[PDB]
Write a protein that holds these residues in place. Structure first.
Motif, PDB file in Angstrom:
ATOM      1  N   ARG E 183      -5.565   9.622   3.310  1.00 28.70           N
ATOM      2  CA  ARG E 183      -4.928   8.402   2.830  1.00 28.70           C
ATOM      3  C   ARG E 183      -5.286   8.178   1.367  1.00 28.70           C
ATOM      4  O   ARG E 183      -6.461   7.995   1.028  1.00 28.70           O
ATOM      5  CB  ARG E 183      -5.362   7.215   3.684  1.00 28.70           C
ATOM      6  CG  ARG E 183      -4.862   7.296   5.114  1.00 28.70           C
ATOM      7  CD  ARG E 183      -5.148   6.021   5.875  1.00 28.70           C
ATOM      8  NE  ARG E 183      -6.578   5.778   6.040  1.00 28.70           N
ATOM      9  CZ  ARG E 183      -7.300   6.236   7.058  1.00 28.70           C
ATOM     10  NH1 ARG E 183      -6.729   6.963   8.008  1.00 28.70           N
ATOM     11  NH2 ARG E 183      -8.597   5.966   7.128  1.00 28.70           N
ATOM     12  N   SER E 185      -4.709   5.677  -0.549  1.00 27.20           N
ATOM     13  CA  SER E 185      -5.032   4.308  -0.922  1.00 27.20           C
ATOM     14  C   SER E 185      -5.998   3.626   0.034  1.00 27.20           C
ATOM     15  O   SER E 185      -6.260   2.429  -0.143  1.00 27.20           O
ATOM     16  CB  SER E 185      -3.750   3.479  -1.023  1.00 27.20           C
ATOM     17  OG  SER E 185      -3.120   3.358   0.241  1.00 27.20           O
ATOM     18  N   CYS E 186      -6.538   4.357   1.019  1.00 26.20           N
ATOM     19  CA  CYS E 186      -7.423   3.850   2.079  1.00 26.20           C
ATOM     20  C   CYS E 186      -6.760   2.685   2.824  1.00 26.20           C
ATOM     21  O   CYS E 186      -7.197   1.534   2.789  1.00 26.20           O
ATOM     22  CB  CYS E 186      -8.802   3.467   1.519  1.00 26.20           C
ATOM     23  SG  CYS E 186     -10.049   3.031   2.759  1.00 26.20           S
ATOM     24  N   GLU E 187      -5.662   3.026   3.480  1.00 30.29           N
ATOM     25  CA  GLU E 187      -4.774   2.082   4.129  1.00 30.29           C
ATOM     26  C   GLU E 187      -5.109   1.954   5.614  1.00 30.29           C
ATOM     27  O   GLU E 187      -5.782   2.825   6.171  1.00 30.29           O
ATOM     28  CB  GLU E 187      -3.323   2.544   3.914  1.00 30.29           C
ATOM     29  CG  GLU E 187      -2.886   2.419   2.464  1.00 30.29           C
ATOM     30  CD  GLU E 187      -2.879   0.976   1.973  1.00 30.29           C
ATOM     31  OE1 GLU E 187      -2.554   0.069   2.768  1.00 30.29           O
ATOM     32  OE2 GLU E 187      -3.210   0.744   0.792  1.00 30.29           O
ATOM     33  N   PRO E 188      -4.698   0.853   6.278  1.00 27.33           N
ATOM     34  CA  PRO E 188      -5.130   0.626   7.675  1.00 27.33           C
ATOM     35  C   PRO E 188      -4.679   1.661   8.700  1.00 27.33           C
ATOM     36  O   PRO E 188      -5.265   1.674   9.791  1.00 27.33           O
ATOM     37  CB  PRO E 188      -4.539  -0.750   8.002  1.00 27.33           C
ATOM     38  CG  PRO E 188      -4.477  -1.434   6.705  1.00 27.33           C
ATOM     39  CD  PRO E 188      -4.144  -0.390   5.697  1.00 27.33           C
ATOM     40  N   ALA E 189      -3.686   2.508   8.390  1.00 26.00           N
ATOM     41  CA  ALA E 189      -3.286   3.667   9.204  1.00 26.00           C
ATOM     42  C   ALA E 189      -2.852   3.246  10.614  1.00 26.00           C
ATOM     43  O   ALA E 189      -3.540   3.482  11.607  1.00 26.00           O
ATOM     44  CB  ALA E 189      -4.395   4.725   9.256  1.00 26.00           C
ATOM     45  N   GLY E 190      -1.685   2.606  10.672  1.00 26.00           N
ATOM     46  CA  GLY E 190      -1.309   1.874  11.865  1.00 26.00           C
ATOM     47  C   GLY E 190      -1.444   0.384  11.638  1.00 26.00           C
ATOM     48  O   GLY E 190      -2.099  -0.331  12.401  1.00 26.00           O
ATOM     49  N   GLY E 191      -0.818  -0.078  10.563  1.00 21.86           N
ATOM     50  CA  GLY E 191      -1.027  -1.404  10.025  1.00 21.86           C
ATOM     51  C   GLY E 191      -1.020  -1.309   8.516  1.00 21.86           C
ATOM     52  O   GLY E 191      -1.263  -2.290   7.805  1.00 21.86           O
ATOM     53  N   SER E 194       2.506  -3.502   7.503  1.00 18.38           N
ATOM     54  CA  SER E 194       2.326  -4.955   7.636  1.00 18.38           C
ATOM     55  C   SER E 194       3.523  -5.752   7.113  1.00 18.38           C
ATOM     56  O   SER E 194       3.355  -6.874   6.624  1.00 18.38           O
ATOM     57  CB  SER E 194       1.032  -5.424   6.960  1.00 18.38           C
ATOM     58  OG  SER E 194      -0.101  -4.854   7.589  1.00 18.38           O
ATOM     59  N   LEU E 195       4.725  -5.169   7.223  1.00 20.48           N
ATOM     60  CA  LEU E 195       6.017  -5.787   6.886  1.00 20.48           C
ATOM     61  C   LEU E 195       6.057  -6.238   5.419  1.00 20.48           C
ATOM     62  O   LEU E 195       6.048  -7.426   5.096  1.00 20.48           O
ATOM     63  CB  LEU E 195       6.344  -6.936   7.854  1.00 20.48           C
ATOM     64  CG  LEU E 195       7.771  -7.497   7.835  1.00 20.48           C
ATOM     65  CD1 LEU E 195       8.770  -6.421   8.206  1.00 20.48           C
ATOM     66  CD2 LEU E 195       7.890  -8.687   8.762  1.00 20.48           C
ATOM     67  N   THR E 196       6.055  -5.234   4.538  1.00 26.43           N
ATOM     68  CA  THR E 196       6.023  -5.467   3.095  1.00 26.43           C
ATOM     69  C   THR E 196       7.271  -6.209   2.604  1.00 26.43           C
ATOM     70  O   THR E 196       8.388  -5.678   2.610  1.00 26.43           O
ATOM     71  CB  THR E 196       5.821  -4.133   2.359  1.00 26.43           C
ATOM     72  OG1 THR E 196       6.005  -4.312   0.947  1.00 26.43           O
ATOM     73  CG2 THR E 196       6.700  -2.985   2.918  1.00 26.43           C
ATOM     74  N   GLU E 197       7.072  -7.458   2.203  1.00 23.34           N
ATOM     75  CA  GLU E 197       8.147  -8.398   1.917  1.00 23.34           C
ATOM     76  C   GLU E 197       7.641  -9.372   0.864  1.00 23.34           C
ATOM     77  O   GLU E 197       6.451  -9.366   0.525  1.00 23.34           O
ATOM     78  CB  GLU E 197       8.581  -9.147   3.192  1.00 23.34           C
ATOM     79  CG  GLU E 197       9.402  -8.345   4.200  1.00 23.34           C
ATOM     80  CD  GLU E 197       9.813  -9.164   5.392  1.00 23.34           C
ATOM     81  OE1 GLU E 197       9.393 -10.332   5.469  1.00 23.34           O
ATOM     82  OE2 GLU E 197      10.549  -8.640   6.253  1.00 23.34           O
ATOM     83  N   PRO E 199       6.305 -13.055   0.095  1.00 19.80           N
ATOM     84  CA  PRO E 199       5.305 -13.628   1.023  1.00 19.80           C
ATOM     85  C   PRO E 199       5.732 -14.940   1.676  1.00 19.80           C
ATOM     86  O   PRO E 199       5.000 -15.937   1.646  1.00 19.80           O
ATOM     87  CB  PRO E 199       4.086 -13.812   0.110  1.00 19.80           C
ATOM     88  CG  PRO E 199       4.683 -14.109  -1.223  1.00 19.80           C
ATOM     89  CD  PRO E 199       5.930 -13.277  -1.315  1.00 19.80           C
ATOM     90  N   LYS E 200       6.926 -14.928   2.284  1.00 19.72           N
ATOM     91  CA  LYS E 200       7.411 -15.962   3.211  1.00 19.72           C
ATOM     92  C   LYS E 200       7.472 -17.351   2.571  1.00 19.72           C
ATOM     93  O   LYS E 200       6.758 -18.276   2.960  1.00 19.72           O
ATOM     94  CB  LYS E 200       6.567 -15.980   4.488  1.00 19.72           C
ATOM     95  CG  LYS E 200       6.698 -14.729   5.327  1.00 19.72           C
ATOM     96  CD  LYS E 200       8.083 -14.660   5.941  1.00 19.72           C
ATOM     97  CE  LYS E 200       8.195 -13.495   6.893  1.00 19.72           C
ATOM     98  NZ  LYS E 200       8.170 -12.223   6.138  1.00 19.72           N
ATOM     99  N   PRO E 202       7.217 -18.857  -1.032  1.00 23.07           N
ATOM    100  CA  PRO E 202       6.344 -19.600  -1.949  1.00 23.07           C
ATOM    101  C   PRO E 202       7.013 -20.892  -2.395  1.00 23.07           C
ATOM    102  O   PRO E 202       8.224 -20.943  -2.615  1.00 23.07           O
ATOM    103  CB  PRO E 202       6.150 -18.631  -3.121  1.00 23.07           C
ATOM    104  CG  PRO E 202       6.466 -17.290  -2.563  1.00 23.07           C
ATOM    105  CD  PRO E 202       7.565 -17.536  -1.583  1.00 23.07           C
TER     106      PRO E 202
END
Ligand SMILES: Cc1cc2nc3c(=O)[nH]c(=O)nc-3n(C[C@H](O)[C@H](O)[C@H](O)COP(=O)(O)O)c2cc1C
Ligand code: SF4
Ligand code: SF4
Ligand code: SF4
Ligand code: SF4
Ligand code: SF4
Ligand code: FES
Ligand code: FES
Lengths: 230, 66, 108, 117, 207, 28, 427
Positions: E183, E185-191, E194-197, E199-200, E202
């Motif tokens: 990895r 970027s040391c990413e959660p690897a199954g997470g 996280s629905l990159t959007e 931020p709901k 502002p």
């Protein structure tokens, strides 16, 4: 006016608002043990020998550097304070070698008049005892830096009254030392007057070195005349 | 002159008693009645010492190298 | 608390607190201080006007025999404004009890 | 464990086991000890005068039980009785000599008794 | 080890770069004046930057620059870790053995390094410039028992990288300043998504 | 990832604008 | 606790781990409503953290809504400053160095915002020198927007607009506790002060300052932005918020994650994504904290949630929030002795309990892993752990007995057979 009655062992006394627990308990005629403290110096706290159990608190505080709030009960003798003055003065009596047949402060060291009254009975360590090396500074200060329980008392004196900025602290953790990094000599006015301040017999006098033990003298007070200030 | 011992005359030379106070200090020297001279008790300053003022914004009372 | 500490007792500390109390009650003429030691001893401080009769009272009774004069001593104490201190020590034969008589005085 | 004549010991090849720590002096009931010490030029401290008032010596033997480096030893020999008062005051150069008329006599008694004390 | 100087190089000497005298003006302008008085932490670091390791005369140089007593300089550089007094090499490399790094099998990223290179444990190279020590507490125990270098970090260390990072630096390469594999970027690897959007919505700050 | 170019950190922007400072006195 | 969640979504305090990590144009979250937040009074912001109740994720409570409003004089004659820590002293945290990796613009917002709650003068931040490649990006972010005139000395809308300066240590320790960093920023060696002088917002640098963590002011813009009644959505009435977690040890993907309060360890660790050791049927000795929370075995801790009081209902709390396991390959006494070995190389040396008391334990813990002589040494070792809690100054004195005393519990034949085996070996 301008006072708080603090019940030192359940007994009132009026100090200034902003003095120390040490000076409060010394006012009523008691001695808490003193290692990292001097009246004629600044105040640090890195020996942690004065530990009194204050009332209405589960913790233990040290009487060197804290003010006094509204009137407490400074419980001097408890069944927990003696679990502390035994406690700290068991560690520092381990990493130390077996001198005093030959330690020249052998009748007045403060590991020798505290260790009968306070503290424990035997030892459980049972091997270890690190051993650092020494050096020479001037032809006045006989120098065994092994003993050197690191009470930071000679160190501040360079920043104190004798303004020669010469000493420091070299190291980390268990391994730190006190002496000058380079071999610069240290001599000026008052430069022989450190060997009273060193509370153990790690520092002593060079010409006096091996003469006699301090329970045979006869102390008679007098005045010296080699200067106009007496 | 056989060993170098501190042999001596001056038959008293070692007599110290334990007094209670200044009041009965004089009254013992007069009750048997020989001459004397009195010092004075020295008690030091109380004194004003407070940690925290050892770190200044404009003062001179400031420690370093601790 | 532990072994190697002297085990004290309260029975003898009770009766010697009891017995010597009514001694000052029945002669409030000579007795000036009574104290109980924490290890079963008794002092009866007596101004030396009653040097004879209080002994004479302890010479004989039916509740206090005390006819065994063991110890006359003498202790000096400077810085007291009356120096010396004559101290007796007498023994009850029938009762196994020790009590001392502290009587001060001066030189002349 | 019998007491008697005084003597001084030393290490293997001669070292003066005494360290002049003065403790035998402060417990002598007759004050028969008198010691003046000095830094010898090598650096380690030793003795200059060392005295046992064999007249005054009341033989409490506490000197044998007070030295940490186990220097002075009550040697078990009752050989005595000179003819003057001027002789029995032992200086140092009797005692090291008297501690070296014998050692195997001394060194076996300590080695058979040091486990008890 | 011992921490003293028994007088081999009392005066080496050493001077600063004329490009570097002007950078002090940015440093002194940071601190409040009067109590400014000690900027010894970046400055003596910059002396380590110019030289690589500093002599005791380099300590005595900056004491006149910032008017402190020179004893107050010996307190600093004999305390911290990254400052050096002994002569050092060109490449300073670190095995970040820590107790969770021990759990990620630091024994593989322990020796087979000294056998590969020809040096001793905790020891500089006999030739020139490789110096190997071990450190603790630099961020990620979540990576492999990683390797620190002079200006970057080598995440995802492995016995292949033992055959690489020692090898490529002997040749003079720059072996992958970061995670060399896995990895990036040391990413959660199954997470990791996280629905990159945006931020709901502002604009909630009425409150 | 560059060992040099601290003048880009120190002397480039932080020297152009501190700002100002006033920094107080504290002489002492 | 609510409905046992603590989920993972996009509605968090993070912009993006993958979106853009260099300097940018402040697209969505950064600098959204800039002047409107600071246009309100400080009394609008003081007590606004009470709506959140952020305890501070450094490893201890005493929430930031209290220490900023209370223990804060208005002014006497001297300025005030801000100390924002960034260095990670605990082993295996990694919660930092990733915030500065891809989110540099988020932290600069709450610096002036959190300082407006104090009214402090400037902003001083402290980064470890060893994190050298990532720290170079931080001044580039100052070059990005601060040098673009967005901040300072009158930007925007008011006279309150100030700077941010970057300093670096070398190998320091003052991450682990405050009041040494305010000493080390002067230039002294780093031997920290006594804890009640005048504590840190009375006696500071030359004038009283405040000290915060990273997420103590990194979440401060967005918690002032989204607000609620949302910052208390998970957890019980005691704790509130959504914190970053980190997973290491023996797992299929050792990585970071985002969760919130009150989640049990059986679902929290095994999710995202794998449990590569024996996820059950191993020993699985878990560590709740960074280092100050000792071993807990395979009992009901996995169903015990991550509340501050739930681990206080366990033997030791944990606020550092680090996850490492020891299931099958790891010897128990082998790893923890290396944790005790670690503390020799970061103790300061001031306190006579701390100095010469740690290396009392160092020489004896190396004797047990070897396997050595007769017991009752354990209890003497246990009394030393019962002898250094409140005698030192810093929390390292508390951080030195807690791994030791928790090993005394829960593991009686950890070495009672092992040291007997050496006693069987010599016999
Ligand atoms: C073992 C231990 C390690 C710590 N390490 C750090 C650290 O590396 N960085 C930090 O900012 N705080 C650390 N802390 C917590 C400090 O006490 C904290 O920074 C300070 O009290 C400010 O609290 P805050 O986190 O709420 O801002 C550590 C605490 C402990 C007990
Ligand atoms: S000389 Fe020894 S006792 Fe005196 S202050 Fe220094 S270390 Fe402490
Ligand atoms: S100085 Fe203290 S510890 Fe050292 S030999 Fe003398 S009495 Fe013992
Ligand atoms: S026996 Fe002990 S006290 Fe006597 S001289 Fe020898 S070392 Fe000193
Ligand atoms: S032999 Fe007896 S009298 Fe002589 S020093 Fe020893 S204890 Fe004292
Ligand atoms: S525990 Fe003692 S030695 Fe360690 S940092 Fe605190 S005061 Fe310093
Ligand atoms: S006596 Fe100096 S700190 Fe306790
Ligand atoms: S501690 Fe070794 S790299 Fe994180």
């Amino acid at each position: 006016s301008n006072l708080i009655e603090v019940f030192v062992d359940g007994q009132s006394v009026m100090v200034e608002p902003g003095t120390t627990v040490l000076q409060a308990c010394e006012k009523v005629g008691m001695q808490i043990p003193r290692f990292c403290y001097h009246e004629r110096l600044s105040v640090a706290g890195n020996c942690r020998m004065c530990l009194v159990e204050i009332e209405k608190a589960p913790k233990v505080v040290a009487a060197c550097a804290m003010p006094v709030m509204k009137g407490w009960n400074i419980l001097t003798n408890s069944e927990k304070t003696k679990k502390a003055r035994e406690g700290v003065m068991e560690f520092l009596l381990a990493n130390h070698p077996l001198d005093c047949p030959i330690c020249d402060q052998g009748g007045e060291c403060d590991l020798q008049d505290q260790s009968m009254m306070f503290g424990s009975d035997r030892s459980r360590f049972l091997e270890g005892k690190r051993a650092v090396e020494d050096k020479n500074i001037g032809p006045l200060v006989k120098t065994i830096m092994t003993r050197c329980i690191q009470c930071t008392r000679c160190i501040r004196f360079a920043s104190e009254i004798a303004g020669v900025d010469d000493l420091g602290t070299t190291g980390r953790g268990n391994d730190m030392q006190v002496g000058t990094y380079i071999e610069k000599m240290f001599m000026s006015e008052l430069s022989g007057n450190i060997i009273d301040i060193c509370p153990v017999g790690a520092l002593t006098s060079k010409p006096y070195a091996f003469t006699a033990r301090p329970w045979e003298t006869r102390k008679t007070e007098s005045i010296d005349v080699m200067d106009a200030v007496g | 002159p056989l060993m170098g011992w501190a042999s001596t005359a001056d038959p008293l030379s070692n007599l110290v008693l334990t007094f209670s106070t200044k009041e009965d200090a004089v009254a013992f020297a007069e009750k048997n009645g020989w001459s004397y001279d009195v010092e004075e008790r020295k008690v030091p300053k109380p004194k004003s010492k407070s940690y925290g003022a050892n770190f200044s914004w404009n003062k001179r009372t400031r420690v370093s190298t601790k | 608390t532990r072994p190697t500490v002297r085990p004290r007792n309260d029975v003898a500390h009770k009766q010697l607190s009891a017995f010597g109390e009514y001694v000052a009650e029945i002669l409030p003429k000579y007795v000036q201080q009574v104290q109980v030691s924490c290890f079963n001893e008794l002092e009866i401080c007596i101004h030396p006007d009653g040097v004879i009769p209080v002994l004479t009272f302890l010479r004989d009774h039916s509740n206090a025999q005390f006819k065994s004069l063991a110890d006359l001593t003498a202790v000096d104490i400077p810085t007291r404004q009356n120096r010396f201190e004559i101290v007796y020590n007498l023994l009850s034969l029938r009762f196994n009890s020790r009590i001392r008589v502290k009587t001060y005085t001066d030189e002349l | 464990r019998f007491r008697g004549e005084h003597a001084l010991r030393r290490y293997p090849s001669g070292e003066e086991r005494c360290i002049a720590c003065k403790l035998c002096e402060a417990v002598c009931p007759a004050q028969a000890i008198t010691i003046e010490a000095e830094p010898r030029a090598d650096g380690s401290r030793r003795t200059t005068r060392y005295d046992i008032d064999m007249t005054k010596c009341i033989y409490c033997g506490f000197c044998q039980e007070a030295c940490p480096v186990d220097a002075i030893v009550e040697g078990p020999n009752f050989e005595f009785s000179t003819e003057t008062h001027e002789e029995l005051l032992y200086n140092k150069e009797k005692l090291l000599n008297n501690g070296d008329k014998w050692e195997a006599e001394i060194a076996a008694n300590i080695q058979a008794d040091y486990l008890y004390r | 080890v011992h921490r003293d100087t028994p007088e081999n190089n009392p005066e080496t000497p050493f001077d600063f770069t004329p490009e570097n005298y002007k950078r002090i003006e940015a440093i002194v302008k940071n601190y409040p004046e009067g109590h400014k008085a000690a900027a010894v932490l970046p400055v003596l670091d910059l002396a380590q930057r110019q030289n690589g390791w500093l002599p005791i005369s380099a300590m005595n140089k900056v004491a006149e620059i910032l008017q402190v007593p020179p004893m107050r300089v010996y307190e600093v550089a004999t305390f911290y870790t990254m400052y050096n007094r002994k002569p050092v090499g060109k490449y300073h490399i670190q095995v970040c053995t820590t107790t969770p790094c021990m759990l990620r099998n630091s024994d593989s990223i322990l020796e087979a390094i000294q056998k590969k290179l020809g040096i001793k444990v905790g020891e500089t190279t006999p030739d020139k410039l490789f110096t190997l020590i071990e450190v603790e507490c630099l961020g990620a125990c979540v990576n492999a028992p990683m390797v620190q270098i002079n200006d970057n970090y080598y995440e995802d260390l492995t016995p292949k990288d033992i055959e690489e990072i020692i090898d490529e630096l002997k040749a003079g390469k720059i072996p992958k300043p970061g995670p060399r594999s896995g990895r990036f970027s040391c990413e959660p690897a199954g997470g990791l998504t996280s629905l990159t959007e945006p931020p709901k919505g502002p604009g909630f700050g009425v409150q | 990832y560059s060992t040099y170019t601290f003048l880009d950190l120190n002397l480039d922007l932080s020297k152009f604008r501190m700002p100002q400072p006033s920094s107080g006195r504290e002489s002492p | 606790f609510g409905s046992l969640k603590d989920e993972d979504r996009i509605f968090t305090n993070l912009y993006g781990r993958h979106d853009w990590r260099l300097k940018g144009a402040q697209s969505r979250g950064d600098w959204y409503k800039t002047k409107e937040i600071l246009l309100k009074g400080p009394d609008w912001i003081l007590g606004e953290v009470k709506t959140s109740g952020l305890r501070g994720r450094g490893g201890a409570g005493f929430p930031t809504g209290l220490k900023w409003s209370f223990m804060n004089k208005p002014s006497d004659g001297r300025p005030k400053y801000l100390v924002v820590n960034a260095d990670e002293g605990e082993p295996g945290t990694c919660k930092d160095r990733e915030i500065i990796r891809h989110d540099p613009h988020k932290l600069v917002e709450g610096c002036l915002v959190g300082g407006r709650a104090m009214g402090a003068r400037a902003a001083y931040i402290y980064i470890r020198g060893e994190f050298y490649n990532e720290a170079s990006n931080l001044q580039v972010a100052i070059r990005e927007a601060y040098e673009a005139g967005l901040i300072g000395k009158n930007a925007c809308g008011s006279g309150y607009d100030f700077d941010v300066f970057v300093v670096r240590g070398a190998g320091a320790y003052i991450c682990g506790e405050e009041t040494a960093l305010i000493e080390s920023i002067e230039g002294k060696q780093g031997k920290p002060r006594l804890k009640p002088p005048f504590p840190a917002d009375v006696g500071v640098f030359g004038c009283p300052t405040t000290v915060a963590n990273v997420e103590t002011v990194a979440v401060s813009p967005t918690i002032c932005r989204r607000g609620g009644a949302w910052f208390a959505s998970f957890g019980r009435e005691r704790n509130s918020g959504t914190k970053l977690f980190n997973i290491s040890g023996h797992v299929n993907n050792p990585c970071t994650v985002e969760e919130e309060m009150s989640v049990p360890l059986k679902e929290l660790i095994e999710k995202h994504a794998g449990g590569v050791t024996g996820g059950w049927d191993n020993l699985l000795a878990v560590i709740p904290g960074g280092s100050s929370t000792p071993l807990i075995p395979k009992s009901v801790c996995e169903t015990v949630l991550m509340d501050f009081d739930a681990l206080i209902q366990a033997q030791t709390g944990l606020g550092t929030a680090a996850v490492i396991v020891m299931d099958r390959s790891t010897d128990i006494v082998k790893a923890i002795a290396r944790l005790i070995e670690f503390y020799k190389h970061e103790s300061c040396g001031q306190c006579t309990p701390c100095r010469e008391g740690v290396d009392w334990m160092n020489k004896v813990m190396a004797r047990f892993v070897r396997g050595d002589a007769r017991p009752a040494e354990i209890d003497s070792l246990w009394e030393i752990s019962k002898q250094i809690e409140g005698h030192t100054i810093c929390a390292l004195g508390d951080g030195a007995a807690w791994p030791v005393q928790g090993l005394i519990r829960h593991f009686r034949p950890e070495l009672e057979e092992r040291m007997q085996q050496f006693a069987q070996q010599h016999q």
